[PDB]
Amino acid sequence: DCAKEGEVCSWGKKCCDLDNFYCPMEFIPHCKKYKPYVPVTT
Numbered sequence: 094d095c096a097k098e099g100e101v102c103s104w105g106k107k108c109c110d111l112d113n114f115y116c117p118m119e120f121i122p123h124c125k126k127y128k129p130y131v132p133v134t135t
Contacts, residue, residue: 102122
């Protein structure tokens, strides 16, 4: 079992593909697809 795209991650579950998806930092994070290659300060 895993959290698909748009599914609650972190406290909820672990995103099926953490490599292609990331878990946001909020009250109820949702699996979101991303592909960064040039991270910047923030």
